[PDB]
Amino acid sequence: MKVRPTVSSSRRKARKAHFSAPSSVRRVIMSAPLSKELREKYNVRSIPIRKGDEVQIVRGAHKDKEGKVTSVYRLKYVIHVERVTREKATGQTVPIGIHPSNVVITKLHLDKDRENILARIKAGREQVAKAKG
Amino acid sequence: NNHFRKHWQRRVRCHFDQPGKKVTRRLARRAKAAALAPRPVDKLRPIVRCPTVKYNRRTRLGRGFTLEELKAAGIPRLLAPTIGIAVDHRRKNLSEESLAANVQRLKDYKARLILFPRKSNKPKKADTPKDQQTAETTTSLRTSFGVEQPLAPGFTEISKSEIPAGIEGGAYRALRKARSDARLVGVREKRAKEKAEAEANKK
Amino acid sequence: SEKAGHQTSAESWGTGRAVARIPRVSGGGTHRAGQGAFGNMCRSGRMFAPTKIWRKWHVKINQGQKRFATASALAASAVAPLLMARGHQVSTVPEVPLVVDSAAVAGDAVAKTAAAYKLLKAIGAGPDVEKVKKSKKLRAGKGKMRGRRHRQRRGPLIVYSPEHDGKELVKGFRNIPGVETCPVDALNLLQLAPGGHLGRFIVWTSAAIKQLDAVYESKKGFFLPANIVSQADLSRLINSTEIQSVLRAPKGEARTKRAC
RNA sequence: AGGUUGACCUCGGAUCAGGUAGGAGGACCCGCUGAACUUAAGCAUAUCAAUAAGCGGAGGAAAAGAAACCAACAGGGAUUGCCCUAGUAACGGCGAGUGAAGCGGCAACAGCUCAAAUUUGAAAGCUGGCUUCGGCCCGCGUUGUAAUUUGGAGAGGAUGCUUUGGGCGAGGCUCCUUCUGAGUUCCCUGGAACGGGACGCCACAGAGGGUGAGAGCCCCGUAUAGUUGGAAGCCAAGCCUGUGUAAAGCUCCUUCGACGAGUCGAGUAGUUUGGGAAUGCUGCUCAAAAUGGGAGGUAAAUUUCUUCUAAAGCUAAAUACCGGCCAGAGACCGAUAGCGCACAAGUAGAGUGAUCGAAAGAUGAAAAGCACUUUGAAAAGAGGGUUAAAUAGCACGUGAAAUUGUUGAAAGGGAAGCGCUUGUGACCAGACUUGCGCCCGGCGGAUCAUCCGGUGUUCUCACCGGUGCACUCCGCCGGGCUCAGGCCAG
RNA sequence: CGGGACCGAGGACCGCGCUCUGCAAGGAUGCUGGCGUAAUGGUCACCAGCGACCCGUCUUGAAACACGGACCAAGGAGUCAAGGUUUUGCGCGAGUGUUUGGGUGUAAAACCCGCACGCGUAAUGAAAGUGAACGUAGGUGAGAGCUUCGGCGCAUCAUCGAC
RNA sequence: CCCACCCAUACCCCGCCCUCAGGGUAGAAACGAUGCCCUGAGGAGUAGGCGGCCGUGGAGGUCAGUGACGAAGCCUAGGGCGUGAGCCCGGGUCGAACGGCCUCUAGUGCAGAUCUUGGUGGUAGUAGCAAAUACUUCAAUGAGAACUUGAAGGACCGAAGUGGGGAAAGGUUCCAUGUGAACAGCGGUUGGACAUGGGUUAGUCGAUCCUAAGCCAUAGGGAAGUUCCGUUUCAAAGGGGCAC
RNA sequence: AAACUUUCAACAACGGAUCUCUUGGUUCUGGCAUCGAUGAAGAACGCAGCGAAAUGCGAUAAGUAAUGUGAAUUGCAGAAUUCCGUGAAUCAUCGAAUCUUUGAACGCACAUUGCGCCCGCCGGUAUUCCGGCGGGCAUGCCUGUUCGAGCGUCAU
């Protein structure tokens, strides 16, 4: 149960904020869990997804398919994964929309910003665990 | 008797904000107490007797102590509101009982007062020393210095030997005589002038 | 809103031969022109008797009657048939009223939700907690879109003493669904008789059980009420020797033979 | 030089140096002005109403406010607001009606500044300009700028004691910032598990939302202590130094002790009030006084008494808030509802104009929004795919009724429709299928009776473990008999 | 002594009786046949015999006149507040009422606190004012209930007294 | 005057429903005691009064309630229960929620109001689609030509025009190319329609300047004020020249 | 017999009721005090590679700077991002800027893109002519400066 007066349990306000969030908030919303070996490697459960990541789909009709994240289409909350596509009537190839909560990240596109993100999340997790221990 | 013949619906006041206003008042009181710590949140008030014959049986808290009360208690009038004593200059002391009660009240407050120095490195003679600066304190002068006995005691036991004889002729007859004398004070004095003038004329 | 259905300019077209005498919106060039207004039967009109904020929302109840009802619900909570009649799973509860030692709850003993849940399972409120856990359902109606999305049953109410047991047990019991907590000096009839039905399952602490008499002695202007009936066992009263030894002979039976 | 040369006063000029005002908003606030419908049978007193409209002026509150008060008591003691006083005192055609205030309880509390005095041993005061920031000028001002005094007093004395200025400051609080627990384990249905079953885990987090169907553990968040980095303020335990040139407080006193004028008040007129004998405001006329003046709710004279001290001014809080900004909620409404507006809504559209003012939400989880073939001028049609579903085809969720088309059945000689009762045709729901008890025969087993021990109970009843050795119990299958079984009938 | 129609309520015994091994006596049993399904029963459509004005609404005594109704869907009209009065339930009871306010809170909830105040506890008079026991709180006649069977007598009514 | 016969919801007998009234029912083997058993009488109804039940939106409790193996809704010559309002089930359709019981609560029940909004009929393929004299042939285009074009004929406006140009008003309707639907009360290949583009060149033409009828500032005077009068005034309302 | 009219049923129409939904209303509660001549509110006209509106913005025009985040935007086109970075974005924050014609609206006007005046700078052969650019010119009132008027009062 929420206690803070700045927190709202209004379903209307929650849905308005979710469906009218800007791009920087949609990036945080479009997060995916890491794989197991990545979780023991980095001590990080979840990260925002981005282009160039390698994912395994764990939900839906395209389960257990793996590929590279070719697109992060934040406007309808979708990632486009390589080779997880379908054909139109004409036979042309169109990507299939996958929500990021239905995939698991198996390989990270690593740049120094991602290293700083992982390092500060790991440091925060460790200092919370030490404070509560 | 229904006074609804005006445009009454335009000034109907409800009170849905009653618990919210209680919460706001409590928050303001807590902020005032935190700002005024370690002083009490209120000022010391004198004990005064209510006007009119309906309420002159009861005492209550007044606005402030009189200048004569402060002079008799030995507190200067410029020092008094700076140490939590309310001062009223309009009220006077017409009798000794209320004056003595309020002087005793001021003396109790001054005896229980702890006065911190303005500069901690240079304490003064009228300042409370640091080894007596620590004690259990109060923060509500309305509670610690309330009206202890607002009404007179309604029951008292005396021995049968010391029962008073009372007014001769009876209390009812005494009241009737008092009313009759009050009604006839003018006519008797007028006939007193008349008898004096007659005696002076026919002496 | 007090101006709803009245933000239009409209007048009736008078008595004639074609249309009714409802006020009609003046002007032209739009669908609103000529349409009815100001009536409770009209579309886009003011309702009959619009609701006002100065309706009487709150009910003043005598404090003596509140204390009477709280005492009655407390007495009903010590009767185990009423606990089953109110839907509580108390078949494994060792004793009613259930008293737990204050050493198991005082301080930070059950400040963790796992420890509080383990204590409930140990004392036997576990089936009731599980009943509340699996009774969760989606609400039928508009309450879902007005912020009341789910319904579930009521579990145990733990009554404690804040002076002797502390207040971290509140945090320990907070996250368990249906489990409620209450100080012994602020007992709530809305919790003691949920929905007006008597027999709430209460887990007591020893400190609260000890402090209950002082709590009901400290209520100024209220005494524990005297019943109009001294012996509630009607069977014992009727079949006692004192009544039965002076009765008449029975003038018939439960079944009467048909004569003709 | 005096027919000149100046000093002042008043009034002007300047695109002079520097400033300020206007308009918007106006829910709440301070004033001015001011209705009628209504209610009085009608209706010029009245009521609506000291309201709506109109006009002027502020702020986050405004206003009011530190008694020319209330009272009549053993006296209270600035203002505001809530409860109560109280539908009371009081006012009112032909009566409909109207209607306070003192006290008391509480919320909040906070007190002061001028004019009337000679600094007269020194205008000690101040705007502006230039500065090397030391000051120096141009001026304002004696028709009065500083210090001192404001009725609570004060001024002058006497008298002996107390008081004060700066600078650091640990620490704390407010506001943004980094970070936070646990399953996507197995099976089934399903297009998709977020459903069902099993096994776990977290919980100071089982609020809310999203994700292909009801998700604490998939994601964002949620709870709690904190934990990174940054700025600006306020509070603050303490600690260093100057000391009395100056100011300030206390006690007593012979004496002195200035205190607001076309104002107060009176008459009259209008208006207003509960104050239509006791109210306030304004206009005209008259027009004060010095223990004087105001008030003391019935007119006047006389003698007393009680209370304050007008005609100058400032001031937070408790109080209001249909405007604005940020936020949290609801036993409210669920697209004819709820705001006129859930949509490119004060939009489209109408009116010369003031103004008036709508209708209109939903494919699908994902466009996967129909390739290709064929017939058509085309719109489209038919095959054939896409989908879990096209019985979802951008006329799109569900798809009622009025009304219409086809198919099937039927009736109909100037109405149909309805009630009772048959009949015909069409179409249906039940009921029934066998149960129970004996007598034989054949199988499969010993949870038959008694006894012993343990346990529980209703304290005499049961269960459990050994005992049955098959003429005793329990099931199954073949035969026979009795009884009860459905519908219509004699 | 025949002939016919319609009906069979109840569900161990008890009773009144008689023509008394039993019975026609406080309500139907016995025997037999066909069929065991659309056969009985039911629904819809239609024909037939008989029956049967179109609804509100208004008017007065009533009709007639008059007025509204092409059809269907969705709205659509004795509500809320304040103050009385009678009755019902509840708490307390010569008292009663926490919620203006304060404390407290898991925070518009619940729980706790008390001064004043409202109503009641005394009335009457324009007012000044005064202010309710002769008596087991009276006598007489009724009066439920109780009684030691002599009476005691609730509520309430009539009547004479008292303050 | 006599005999027989017909039938009313009237009278008699029996069954069943409701109402009312009168009885019974505990040392309870005992009961939705708010129940059951026994007996008798009665049954129309406007205004009006009272009681009980059915239904709808929402709230507390509860049913360890139903549900993608299909909730709600809708259709049904398909059935069951109730005197009834209604309740329940079968079948089809459909796609995400909903119900029973006890209390609480209300914006809670429609045939009418010449209602309100929306939708749809008969009339009915009906009334009309008849002022302004009038059209015809060949070819082309095109799926399609009375109302497109070219040619060929016939006519009309008749110089106060059915001509050539402007003022007001409109605002792109002007020109070229293309065009499915809609509109052009038929038809359309055409269009002032729809789609994309293009087009308006000034020292001399107008505006701009002048003043007319008139209107508005300033000085100043009214008005609580929004503002009214005032336009030459009861205004210090400015131009030029010269200078050893 | 058919047709026609009417009744019943199935399917298909017409129409948009019902049910479920809800980035919206409505009511209550809490917090805050901040428009404008340093030019407001409002109005008009413009600005995107491809927009009419809504949205955002002002010739620095669906935008600039700065801080933060850290890899998009998306309907098409076209470019990205040294991804180990002075850095995508219709991102967030927001302290620096830009801010057309107007409007209390301010040179005089305005039914005109009309008519002026003062002072600088630049260009065209230019002491004279022509053109462009920049800074200014409302009213009432206050304080001060300076220039004045008047036998109004005086001195000399």
Q: HEC string of C69-136?
A: HHHHHHHHCCCHHHHHHCCCCCCCCCCCCEEECHHHCCCCCCCCHHHHHHHHHHHCCHHHHHHHHHCC
* A-C contacts at Cβ under 8 angstroms: 7
End-to-end alpha carbon distance in chain B: 72
Cα separation, C9 vs C33, whole angstroms: 10
Beta bridge partners of A72: A79
Q: For chain D, which bases have at least one atom within 7 A of a protein Cβ?
A: 47-51, 67, 70-78, 87-88, 97-99, 103-112, 152-153, 162-167, 178-182, 184-185, 191-194, 202-212, 214-215, 218-227, 235, 237-243, 249-252, 307-308, 318-322, 327-330, 332-334, 336-341, 346, 348-351, 355-359, 365-372, 384-386, 388
Identity (one letter) of the amino acid at C139?
A: R
Residue C197 DSSP one-character state: -
Q: For chain G, which bases have at least one atom within 7 A of a protein Cβ?
A: 20-31, 68-75, 81, 83-85, 87, 89-92
Q: Are B79 and B66 in contact (CB under 8 A)?
A: no
Q: Please indicate whether, in this complex, the C-beta atoms of A10 and C147 are within 8 angstroms of each other.
A: yes
What separation in angstroms does the CA of C183 have from each of C74, C189, C207, C211, C215?
14, 13, 11, 10, 11
Find the helix packing angle between C113-123 and C126-134, rounded to 10°.
120
Q: Are C27 and C33 in contact (CB under 8 A)?
A: yes
Cα separation, C226 vs C212, whole angstroms: 19
What separation in angstroms does the CA of C92 have from each of C95, C114, C128, C197?
9, 21, 10, 22
Q: Is any Cβ of chain A less than 8 angstroms from the Cβ of C18?
A: no
Identity (one letter) of the amino acid at A73?
A: Y
What separation in angstroms does the CA of C162 have from each of B88, C37, C125, C208?
46, 62, 22, 9
Instruction: Judge C/A contact: 3 or more CB pairs < 8 A.
Output: yes
A40 phi, psi to nearest 5 deg = -70, -20
Determine the distance in angstroms separating the CA of C107 from the nearest CA of chain A, rounded to an integer. Answer: 18
What separation in angstroms does the CA of C236 have from each of C76, C228, C233?
22, 17, 5
Taking the CA atoms of residue B17, residue B21, residue B22 and residue B24 in that order, the dihedral angle to the nearest 10 degrees is 140
Q: Are B142 and B61 in contact (CB under 8 A)?
A: yes
Cα separation, B101 vs B145, whole angstroms: 13
Determine the distance in angstroms separating the CA of A18 from the nearest CA of chain C, rounded to an integer. Answer: 17
Q: Is any Cβ of chain B less than 8 angstroms from the Cβ of C247?
A: no
Residues of C whose CB is below 8 A from B16: 53
Q: Give the three-class secondary structure for A123.
A: helix
Determine the distance in angstroms separating the CA of A131 from the nearest CA of chain C, rounded to an integer. Answer: 16
Chains touching A by CB (3 or more pairs below 8 Å): C
Q: From residues 1-20 of B, which are strand G contacts by CB within 7 A? A: 14, 16-17, 20
End-to-end alpha carbon distance in chain C: 74
Largest CA distance in chain B: 91
Q: C64: Cβ–Cβ under 8 A, 6 or more apart, which residues?
A: C221, C222
Q: For chain F, which bases have at least one atom within 7 A of a protein Cβ?
A: 23-28, 30-31, 33, 35-40, 57-67, 97-99, 102-103, 107, 113-118
Instruction: Judge A/B contact: 3 or more CB pairs < 8 A.
Output: no
Nucleic strand F under 7 Å from the C-beta of C139: yes
DSSP E strand stretches across A1-128: 31-33, 46-48, 54-57, 66-73, 78-81, 85-87, 93-95, 103-107
Beta bridge partners of A93: A87
Q: From residues 176-215 of C, which are strand F contacts by CB within 7 A? A: 194-197
* B-C contacts at Cβ under 8 angstroms: 4
Interface of A with C in 6-45 (CB under 8 A): 9-11
Cα–Cα nearest to C83, from C187, C188, C202: C202
Cα angle: C10, vertex C11, C13; to 5 degrees: 130
Which structure tokens are listed for A2?
């929420």
Residues of C whose CB is below 8 A from B8: none
Q: Which nucleotide is nearest to C53 (CA to C1')?
A: G27
Chains touching B by CB (3 or more pairs below 8 Å): C
Residues of A whose CB is below 8 A from C174: 1
| SS3 assignment for chain B | CCCCCCCHHHHCCCCCCHHHHHHHHHHHHHHHHHHHCCCCCCCECCEEECCHHHHCCEEEECCCECHHHHHHHCCCCCCHHHHCECECCCCCCCCHHHHHHHHHHHHHHHHHCCCCCCCCCCCCCCCCCHHHCCCCCCCCHHHHCCCCCCECCCCCCCCHHHCCCCCCCCHHHHHHHHHHHHHCHHHHHHHHHHHHHHHHHCC
DSSP E strand stretches across C116-239: 137-138, 150-151, 157-160, 180-183, 202-205
Q: Which nucleotide is nearest to C137 (CA to C1')?
A: D214
Interface of C with A in 139-198 (CB under 8 A): 145, 147, 149, 174-175
Q: Give the three-class secondary structure for A91.
A: coil
Q: Are A56 and A106 in contact (CB under 8 A)?
A: yes
Q: How far is CA A113 from the centre of its chain?
A: 16
Nucleic strand F under 7 Å from the C-beta of C3: no
